[PDB]
Amino acid sequence: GPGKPESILKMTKKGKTLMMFVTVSGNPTEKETEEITSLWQGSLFNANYDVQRFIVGSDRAIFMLRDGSYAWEIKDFLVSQDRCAEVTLEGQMYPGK
């Protein structure tokens, strides 16, 4: 919600491609993976954002964000929906962990 790191996206700006690796563990298998990957990255493209989102493993998902203006709202959805496990942003020292 309000604790989304606005600092990094507005300070970097110019549409910096930030890849985000998400660990997801409501299901300690690929079930949360599948749930999240298909529903989210399906809607991640359905809401026409310019991103690449991947099935990267059992209890591992990604949303590779590009426009520099939408990732941490998505982060809020994650931990409201994947049960709530782990978000890892790309870059050095994220002030919103």
Swiss-Prot record:
Region: Escort domain; residue ranges are 69-97
Q: What residue ranges are annotated as transmembrane?
A: none
Tissue occurrence: Expressed in many tissues, but not in skeletal muscles. In the retina expressed in retinal ganglion cells, inner and outer plexiform layers, photoreceptor inner and outer segments and retinal pigment epithelium (at protein level).
Q: Disulfide connectivity?
A: none
Q: What is the consequence of disrupting this locus?
A: Disruption of embryonic polarity and mesoderm differentiation, likely resulting from a primary defect in Wnt signaling.
Annotated localization: Endoplasmic reticulum
According to the record's subunit comment, the protein's assembly and interactions are: Monomer. Interacts with LRP5; the interaction prevents LRP5 from forming aggregates and chaperones LRP6 to the plasma membrane. Interacts with LRP6; the interaction prevents LRP6 from forming aggregates and chaperones LRP6 to the plasma membrane. Interacts with LRP4; the interaction promotes glycosylation of LRP4 and its cell-surface expression.
Biological function: Chaperone specifically assisting the folding of beta-propeller/EGF modules within the family of low-density lipoprotein receptors (LDLRs). Acts as a modulator of the Wnt pathway through chaperoning the coreceptors of the canonical Wnt pathway, LRP5 and LRP6, to the plasma membrane. Essential for specification of embryonic polarity and mesoderm induction. Plays an essential role in neuromuscular junction (NMJ) formation by promoting cell-surface expression of LRP4. May regulate phagocytosis of apoptotic retinal pigment epithelium (RPE) cells.
Q: Which family does it belong to?
A: Belongs to the MESD family.
Notes concerning its domains: The chaperone domain provides a folding template for proper folding of the beta-propeller (BP) domains of LRP5/6. The escort domain ensures LRP5/6 safe-trafficking from the ER to the Golgi by preventing premature ligand-binding.
**Name by which UniProt lists this protein:** LRP chaperone MESD
Q: What is the lineage of its organism?
A: Eukaryota, Metazoa, Chordata, Craniata, Vertebrata
Q: Which portion of the entire protein is included?
A: 89 to 184 of 224
